[PDB]
Design a protein around this ligand. Structure first.
Ligand code: MG
Ligand code: MG
Ligand code: MG
Ligand code: MG
Ligand code: MG
Ligand code: MG
Ligand code: MG
Ligand code: MG
Ligand code: MG
Ligand code: MG
Ligand code: MG
Ligand code: MG
Ligand code: MG
Ligand code: MG
Ligand code: MG
Ligand code: MG
Ligand code: MG
Ligand code: MG
Ligand code: MG
Ligand code: MG
Ligand code: MG
Ligand code: MG
Ligand code: MG
Ligand code: MG
Ligand code: MG
Ligand code: MG
Ligand code: MG
Ligand code: MG
Ligand code: MG
Ligand code: MG
Ligand code: MG
Ligand code: MG
Ligand code: MG
Ligand code: MG
Ligand code: MG
Ligand code: MG
Ligand code: MG
Ligand code: MG
Ligand code: MG
Ligand code: MG
Ligand code: MG
Ligand code: MG
Ligand code: MG
Ligand code: MG
Ligand code: MG
Ligand code: MG
Ligand code: MG
Ligand code: MG
Ligand code: MG
Ligand code: MG
Ligand code: MG
Ligand code: MG
Ligand code: MG
Ligand code: MG
Ligand code: MG
Ligand code: MG
Ligand code: MG
Ligand code: MG
Ligand code: MG
Ligand code: MG
Ligand code: MG
Ligand code: MG
Lengths: 59, 102, 90, 59
RNA sequence: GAGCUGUACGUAAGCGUUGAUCCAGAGAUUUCCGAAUGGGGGAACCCACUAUCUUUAGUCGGAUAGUAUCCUUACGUGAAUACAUAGCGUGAGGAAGGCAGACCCAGGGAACUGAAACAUCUAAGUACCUGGAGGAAGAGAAAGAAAAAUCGAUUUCCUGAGUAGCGGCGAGCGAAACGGAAAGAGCCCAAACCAAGAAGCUUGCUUCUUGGGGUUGUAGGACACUCUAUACGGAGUUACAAAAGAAAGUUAUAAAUGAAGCGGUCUGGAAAGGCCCGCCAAAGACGGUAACAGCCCGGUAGUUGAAAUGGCUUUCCCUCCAGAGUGGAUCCUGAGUACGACGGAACACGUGAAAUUCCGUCGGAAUCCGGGAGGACCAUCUCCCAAGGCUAAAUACUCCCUAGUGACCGAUAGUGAACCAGUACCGUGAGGGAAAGGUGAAAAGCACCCCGGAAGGGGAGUGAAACAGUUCCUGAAACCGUGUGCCUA
RNA sequence: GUAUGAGUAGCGAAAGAAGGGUGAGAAUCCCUUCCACCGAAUAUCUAAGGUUUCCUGAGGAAGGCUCGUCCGCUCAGGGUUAGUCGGGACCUAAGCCGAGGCCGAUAGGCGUAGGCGAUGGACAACAGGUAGAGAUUCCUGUACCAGUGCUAAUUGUUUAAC
């Protein structure tokens, strides 16, 4: 449920590496901001990524 | 089975080979037949409500149905049997004399 | 379902002994209440019931050789009728 | 069975009631120890069952 | 088509040629628990409310139906707060849970071990957990493979080849195209434009919906004109639009018919065996029967059969349908996209001279005089047209049903389980987990007498056999006894 | 599966004796008398836990550390009765579940309204009898709690009994 409501990007896993190439597990998160938009004829607060926010949505 | 209660029987094999008798009972589940005067056994029976005195009772025992052949009511010899639907009923037919046993 | 609430009478020494005090012992199905038993008895037998007592019996463990099980559960009712009432023959 | 279908769906239930009374009396006699032939129980039970079958299938 | 009321004996009471028991198709009934759903709960229990009816003199009692939560939708009521929204109520649709310990797609993801230590690497994207499925899934109609010449959507198999490569260049990991086969099938959008309606008033305009038109690289389409065509013809519920109804045939789920030795004789408890004679065969499969049966029984080859229900195939019905050409003003051809930096992952490819694909974060195009690839990159050439979607077959697996097979086991074997076995038993629990087949052809399962309370014996009897007597075919060794030939204080 | 150790270790705290009986059989079962032991228990109730072990009639293979005619053992029949006792239909504590809600790769975690949950709060019956097995439950006397109908008087009607 912690994900963007437009272009629903969320966290994904991957590796953290050191010099000497030791490998460990980590995640990458999206920068979702809690913003008030019109999901219907009504406004509400939702998670929206900052990428989906630079052209098109109405705050 | 091929042999019914109330039929006439010729015994084809066994200790009583060559004898004839009548069917007193039939046991199709276990495939045996009871025939009068055939295969007599002696039972040692204690006194009981049935058989008040008890003793060595000489009675009959079943034999296998394959040791048996039907006797033609007219020709009087053991025959294999066929089946012919004559009228509204399927009847048994002697396969030597070509006649109806029933 | 009066004939379903009452199954059969109970015939033992204790029940036969109490037969003379206008008390009748019956086996009833395991879901019936006292009131249902009372009205079923009054409809089947045309008596006037004064009181009903009930009790429950568990099944007994039994064995008949390598196999063990239980007998049925039972619900037992004693019905006492009024002084000015007819009787049940048994 | 075919003669049951000749009844007017109201005498059918009178027959059912009479059969239920007979079955109860039979079980009373069996418990008391005064029932001579016990094969009547099956007959009465099957008769009631077929009454009910014919009533139900008439809807 | 003559017996039957199971294992399972027996007693009792009954039923069947006025056709039972039995076999196959289709119906009816189907307590309580369990997603469990009126509320609760320690599984199979407890306690209700609302309507209609019923019983009683009335409380008491009884019957039937409805009553969970969430999602979508229609209608109605309705706050702070004026309009309105949130909220609340009713109705209509849908979901929920299980599993075949298999097969496949996705999210997350070890360690032991190997490297003769060990950290990069390996094991291995394995085990495992979680979510979605389907009878298959996934992939799929070129921004492809290639290279003096071309091919023409995917998938699977054989080769290429342990090659080219990757790699503390160690241990190890390891392709692809060409070539040969199985199977084969192609299509719908978005956008230019047309027509209609509606909202904003961007105020005579844009922007929302519906319908038509149109989908491609020799560029294609809109747009202009010619020709034909509105069912003449064509297609269809497996993609290409979707829902029905008939008839014929075939098949599956019970069955019917079906040849030929009672042949003589020997042994025997019994003949299917030995010896001597016959016969059938589109039938000498298999099993049974007192010992080893083509001709005794059930059957087998061949030939027939279906009231009812299911499947499949054809035909009808039904339903739906514009496709060629010539032009090159103007217009359209998928944007926070492709790409780039940084950090990671997948590619046989460990950052490397690293193309190609994906994820997070920032920046960020062109648009036919356009864009991408050909293993850094530039120029030339060649091939192609991304950022929308659907698609059968060839491939994977077996909890099952039907018919069979085996130089597979034969009771310490074969399943843990040939026997009332996931049972007995052990453990708080998750869980662990046995032992145990054989009388006889037929119960003919020992009437009667004797010792003994019985158990157990000795006779008598049955049987071919009782030294086959209800842990019963055979009956080895250890081990325990009684008797005796030779030796021994 | 069967030996050796071996007829060996052991037979799990304690006072018994005699006379009658039963029986195929008696140190061990029944009866009588005398003796001995416990007695803030080794007595009487009652929660938990067990689940038919309870009563009667038969029995003596196995079980009982010996014996057994006996048994908590085997077989067949029986036995548990509530308006008032303890629990539910009444209440809540710790704790648990939890519509919407908040949070989070999945799975889920937390939590409001609400609801479950006694070890606690509230709540009406006593004394006798019962010889095979139940008793504040059955029966006999005498009660109480909550309700209902039917009678008989009283009283009230929308400035409104209740
Ligand atoms: Mg690694
Ligand atoms: Mg962002
Ligand atoms: Mg930004
Ligand atoms: Mg009552
Ligand atoms: Mg009770
Ligand atoms: Mg009980
Ligand atoms: Mg009881
Ligand atoms: Mg039912
Ligand atoms: Mg439930
Ligand atoms: Mg519930
Ligand atoms: Mg209960
Ligand atoms: Mg009522
Ligand atoms: Mg509303
Ligand atoms: Mg207002
Ligand atoms: Mg499911
Ligand atoms: Mg499935
Ligand atoms: Mg690792
Ligand atoms: Mg790996
Ligand atoms: Mg690897
Ligand atoms: Mg799974
Ligand atoms: Mg499916
Ligand atoms: Mg397939
Ligand atoms: Mg697919
Ligand atoms: Mg193609
Ligand atoms: Mg295309
Ligand atoms: Mg081509
Ligand atoms: Mg193939
Ligand atoms: Mg179209
Ligand atoms: Mg054109
Ligand atoms: Mg002969
Ligand atoms: Mg002889
Ligand atoms: Mg011969
Ligand atoms: Mg053959
Ligand atoms: Mg054979
Ligand atoms: Mg022959
Ligand atoms: Mg653009
Ligand atoms: Mg490039
Ligand atoms: Mg690059
Ligand atoms: Mg290439
Ligand atoms: Mg190309
Ligand atoms: Mg697809
Ligand atoms: Mg053996
Ligand atoms: Mg045998
Ligand atoms: Mg045998
Ligand atoms: Mg004696
Ligand atoms: Mg004896
Ligand atoms: Mg022998
Ligand atoms: Mg023998
Ligand atoms: Mg021996
Ligand atoms: Mg020996
Ligand atoms: Mg000697
Ligand atoms: Mg020993
Ligand atoms: Mg004494
Ligand atoms: Mg017991
Ligand atoms: Mg013992
Ligand atoms: Mg001892
Ligand atoms: Mg005695
Ligand atoms: Mg006893
Ligand atoms: Mg109470
Ligand atoms: Mg309550
Ligand atoms: Mg009280
Ligand atoms: Mg009163």
């Amino acid at each position: 449920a912690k994900e963007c409501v437009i272009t629903g990007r969320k966290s994904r896993s991957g590796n953290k590496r050191s010099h000497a190439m030791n490998s460990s597990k980590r995640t990458w998160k999206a920068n979702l901001q809690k913003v008030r938009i019109l999901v219907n004829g009504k406004p509400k607060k939702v998670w929206v990524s900052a990428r989906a926010l630079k052209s098109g949505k109405v705050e | 089975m091929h042999v019914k209660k109330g039929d006439k029987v010729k015994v084809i094999t066994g200790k009583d080979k060559g004898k004839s008798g009548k069917v007193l009972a039939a046991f199709p589940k276990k495939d045996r037949v009871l025939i009068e005067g055939i295969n007599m056994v002696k039972k040692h029976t204690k006194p009981s409500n049935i058989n008040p005195q008890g003793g060595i009772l000489n009675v009959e025992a079943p034999i296998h149905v394959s040791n048996v052949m039907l006797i033609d009511p007219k020709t009087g010899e053991p025959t294999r049997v066929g089946y012919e639907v004559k009228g509204d009923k399927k009847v048994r037919v002697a396969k030597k004399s070509g006649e109806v046993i029933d | 379902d009066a004939r379903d609430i009452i199954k059969r009478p109970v015939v033992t020494e204790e029940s036969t002994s109490i037969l003379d005090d206008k008390k009748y012992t019956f086996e009833v199905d395991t879901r019936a209440t006292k009131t249902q038993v009372k009205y079923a008895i009054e409809e089947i037998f045309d008596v006037k019931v004064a009181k009903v007592n009930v009790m429950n019996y568990k099944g007994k463990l039994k064995r008949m050789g390598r196999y063990a099980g239980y007998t049925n559960k039972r619900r037992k009712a004693i019905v006492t009728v009024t002084a000015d009432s007819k009787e049940i023959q048994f | 069975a075919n003669d049951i279908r000749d009844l007017s769906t109201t005498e059918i239930q009178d027959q059912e009631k009479a059969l239920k009374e007979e079955l109860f009396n039979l079980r009373f006699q069996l418990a008391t120890g005064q029932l001579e032939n016990t094969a009547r129980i099956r007959e009465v039970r099957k008769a009631i069952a077929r009454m009910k079958t014919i009533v139900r299938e008439r809807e």
